């Protein structure tokens, strides 16, 4: 379910967002979604424990686009983790705890991200945006 939702971010290129939180002992997945509203997302970052893969995708009027899969998966159920997202113009970059970077294109050319939600087995304990 919906853990966290924020509206009216005014997050722009050069922006950095730091999300720390607890992954449920029973999690099968969680997602950090960034866009302009629930049905329009620049970045859906979704670690999936069953397939041991991080899937990224974008959502356009509630239509999912073509996903990207990263098999560098060092997430653990029951743990507290820090995820850093950077809004880098033509792409998003997600830095993981092990220092791996997941890169995802800013396909639809957002210049501002106003909406965030976090769903699934992830309880936010710290959030910072600049």
Ligand X SMILES: OC[C@H]1O[C@@H](O[C@H]2[C@H](O)[C@@H](O)[C@H](O)O[C@@H]2CO)[C@H](O)[C@@H](O)[C@H]1O
The binding site for its own copies (CB under 8 A) comprises 1-10, 123-130
What residues from 62 to 101 belong to the interface with ligand X (CB under 6 A)?
Answer: 64, 67
* C-alpha radius of gyration, the chain, whole number: 13
How many CA atoms does the CB half-sphere of 61 hold within 13 Å? 0
For residue 81, the partner it binds in ligand X, its own copies, none, with Cβ less than 5 to 8 A by kind, is none
Cβ 47 to ligand X shortest distance, Å: 10
E strands present in 24-90: 30-37, 40-48, 53-60, 63-64, 68-70, 80-88
Residue 55, interface with ligand X (CB under 6 A)? yes
- The minimum distance between CB 68 and its own copies, in angstroms, equals 28
9 and 127 Cβ atoms separated by less than 8 Å:
no
Q: Which residues bind ligand X (CB under 6 A)?
A: 44, 46, 55, 57, 64, 67
């Amino acid at each position: 379910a919906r853990m966290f939702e924020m509206f009216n971010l005014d997050w722009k290129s050069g922006g950095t967002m730091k999300i720390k939180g607890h992954i449920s002992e029973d999690a099968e997945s969680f997602a950090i979604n960034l866009g302009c509203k629930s049905s329009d997302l620049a970045l859906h970052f979704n670690p999936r424990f069953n397939e041991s893969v991080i899937v990224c995708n974008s959502l356009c009027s509630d239509n999912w686009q073509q996903e990207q899969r990263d098999k560098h998966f060092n997430f653990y159920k029951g743990s507290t983790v820090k995820i850093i997202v950077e809004f880098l113009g033509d792409k998003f970059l997600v830095k993981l705890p092990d220092g791996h970077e997941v890169e995802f294109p800013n396909r639809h050319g957002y210049d501002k991200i106003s909406y965030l939600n976090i769903l699934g087995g992830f309880k936010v304990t710290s959030f910072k945006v600049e």
